[PDB]
Amino acid sequence: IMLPWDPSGKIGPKKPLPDHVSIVEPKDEILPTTPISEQKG
Amino acid sequence: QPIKLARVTKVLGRTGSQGQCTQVRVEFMDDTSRSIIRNVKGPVREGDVLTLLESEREARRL
Amino acid sequence: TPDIKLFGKWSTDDVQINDISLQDYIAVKEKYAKYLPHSAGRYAAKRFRKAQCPIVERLTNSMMMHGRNNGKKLMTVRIVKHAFEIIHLLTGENPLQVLVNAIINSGPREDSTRIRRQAVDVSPLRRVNQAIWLLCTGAREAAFRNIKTIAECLADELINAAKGSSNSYAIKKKDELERVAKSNR
Amino acid sequence: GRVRTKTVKKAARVIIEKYYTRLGNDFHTNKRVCEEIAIIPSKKLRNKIAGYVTHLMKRIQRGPVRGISIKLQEEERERRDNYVPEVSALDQEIIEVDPDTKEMLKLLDFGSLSNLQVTQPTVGMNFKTPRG
RNA sequence: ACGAGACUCUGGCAUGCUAACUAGUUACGCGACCCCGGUCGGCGUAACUUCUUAGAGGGACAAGUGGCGUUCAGCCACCCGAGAUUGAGCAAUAACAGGUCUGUGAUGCCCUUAGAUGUCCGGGGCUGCACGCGCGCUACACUGACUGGCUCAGCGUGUGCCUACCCUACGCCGGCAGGCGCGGGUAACCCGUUGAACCCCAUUCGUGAUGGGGAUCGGGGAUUGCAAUUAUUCCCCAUGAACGAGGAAUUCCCAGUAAGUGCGGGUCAUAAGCUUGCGUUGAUUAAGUCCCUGCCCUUUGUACACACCGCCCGU
Predict the structure, then answer these.
(1) Helices C124-142 and C150-163 sit at what angle, rounded to 10 degrees?
(2) Is the dihedral angle over the CA atoms C3, C8, C9, C15 positive or is it negative?
């Protein structure tokens, strides 16, 4: 039985496959052309 | 009879039965125009001198 | 000293490589002229690192052969020392110059190869290797079951081989190979 | 031999696909970018894919891609095919019509048209490659 | 999707990082001799981790430059450096009527079972010797042997539930192998600073089957054991065999590698010509080819499929 994966290790291992690369997703970057000053107090 | 020299200008691979003769383009030191192709026993880097005991024989290329 | 690094008590300069071919593959001079043959090693990592190794060290390493003498470099540096002191008493010349001419006048210029048996030319690095190897083997056999010691046989080999005296084991093997190569050239 | 496996390349390619603008030339600066943007449980694999991210980055500045789709190739490419020229080679003044394209246009409503120039015929009925 | 790779261990370095009476070092008081000064693994100690032990993180990627590469993939150099290809482990699909029923209280069936093929005790045997093969060890010497003198290791083991058989310091007696008191250690604490061999330095020996070689063999002394004869091993003295580098054939091997020389572990009441590990001295030659032997792809041919150790013809 090849054990399934969890970050904890409740069901099986804690380390992923050494060949596994999980490239985490970025957000949608908001960028202006007009300079905004974010001063508050 | 003469004993002549020749400098290795280019290497042309490795021939023989067991892969032991290095085929070499040598350049004479009487005329620096006159080139022949020569079979060499032993390790050869490009840009060293050989002693030719007969300066007439030119080897079979591929 | 910045004057001259004398090989124990021997000369560095006035040691000419009088052949215009083997001048690269003979290390005796200028950058490789040291107090002893014995080095760290590391000349057997790449292909053409073995040529820059000093010949006193090459002839040192070549002299420890046939099982019982394997890895006795402290014995062989001492054999070289004794056989070098002997040459200066017997010849009247720097033993390095007598060695240089012995290596140069021993290396065979042509050889035969199975392509059928065809004569080929010989590389200058093989000429240095075969010259050193034939001289050490001649010294090795000459001092076997004999009262004449190894340094006495080694010096007698290098004097006869510098002269081309024809009593050398190295010259007789050299003249054999060049004649046998010429037989099928 | 130092060939990177498909595992290295198809992790490196998607690292540039998402995070191109963060990356640079030298190996050390964007090995540290590969820390956060990629979960890698192997520092040899980390330095292998980081090393390829730099090599793939160096060749991006020369021009085209395998199929990585950087967002400033798209601006240029779209500007080449959202292209509006001036009066060009479909808005002509002279058309060199053939000896018998004249008399085929005469079959239609466009017999004596305004702006065609009947080319004098090409004598020497010779258009075939010689055999051999 | 598997295998390759990635992976885990190990090796190299780190004056930076963490910590040390079961590791040290530097400086200091004291003690010894010393011709103002050296050595001290002689005593004790206020800092520190360069040496040591094992932790965590870094570090190395063909990354920089130059060629070649249509040209991506890459290849070869050179700089920089602790490394610019360390060494292992793990290891697919499909098989072989390989080997093991003498590892098993895993084992179907067959055969035994008080006429034992069950079980223990007393002896013998696996070693017997006209021969033939394989793995080894010592050598055939002077690059050596014998006798003195000098200076350095690294892997491990240890008082066993059965289980005694540990490891051994120090001091006596014995030529020696050993014996006897008296400790220390369940171990970075003791053996132990593991004073290992070879090598190095000095003596004799002199090409002689010699002080090369140490088989066979006679006599005597302890140890282990309940018991040693067909001699357990080990010590002494005597005996001093073949063998002058090994025919045809043939094995292993490319860097701390081969080879030499020692030391641990297992076996072990007794015990290494074996095996498995460790260090030490340290090479020659090669950076190649498909010529031999074999392996993997692609075409191609086939009367082969227990598949060339195949099939098959005629007198």
Answers:
(1) 140
(2) negative
Q: Which of C130, C125, C136 lies closest to C64 in space, CA to CA?
A: C136
Q: Which of residues 79-108 of C touch strand E (CB under 7 A)?
A: 79
Resolution stated for this PDB structure, in Å: 3.2
Tokens at D36, concatenated: 């956060």
The number of residues in chain B equals 62
Cα-based distances in Å from C138 to C27, D25, D35: 22, 61, 65
C44: which nucleotide lies closest, measuring CA to C1'? E255
CB within 8 Å: C185 and B57: yes
Instruction: Give the method of determination.
Output: cryo-EM
- List all chains that touch chain D, counting a touch as 3 or more CB pairs closer than 8 Å: A
Residue C45 approaches strand E within 7 Å at CB: yes
CB neighbours (10 Å) of residue D88? Answer: 7
DSSP D20-53: STT--SSHHHHHTHHHHHSB-S-HHHHHHHHHHH
Name the nearest CA neighbour of C98 among C184, C11, C185, C22: C11
Interface test mutation site (partner A, options D5, D10, D13, D18, max chain A beta carbons within 10 A): D18
Q: Crossing angle, helix D43-60 and helix D6-18, to 10 degrees?
A: 60
Q: Which domains does chain C have, with CATH numbers?
A: 6-183 (1.10.455.10)
Q: Among partner residues B20, B38, B53, which is closest to C109 by beta-carbon distance? A: B53
Helix, strand or coil for residue D96? strand
How many CA atoms does the CB half-sphere of B46 hold within 13 Å? 6
- Interchain pair A23, D39: CB under 8 A: yes
Say yes or no: Cβ of C27 under 7 A from any atom of strand E: no
Q: How many domains in chain B?
A: 1
- What is the distance between the alpha carbons of residues C75 and B54, in angstroms, rounded to a whole number? 43
Tell me the nearest-neighbour CA distance from C23 into chain B, angstroms: 10
Q: Residue C43 and residue C58: Cα distance in Å, rounded?
A: 10
Give the CATH number for residue B11. 2.40.50.140
- Terminal-residue alpha carbon distance, chain D: 48
Q: Could you tell me if D61 and D77 are in contact, meaning their C-beta atoms sit under 8 angstroms apart?
A: no
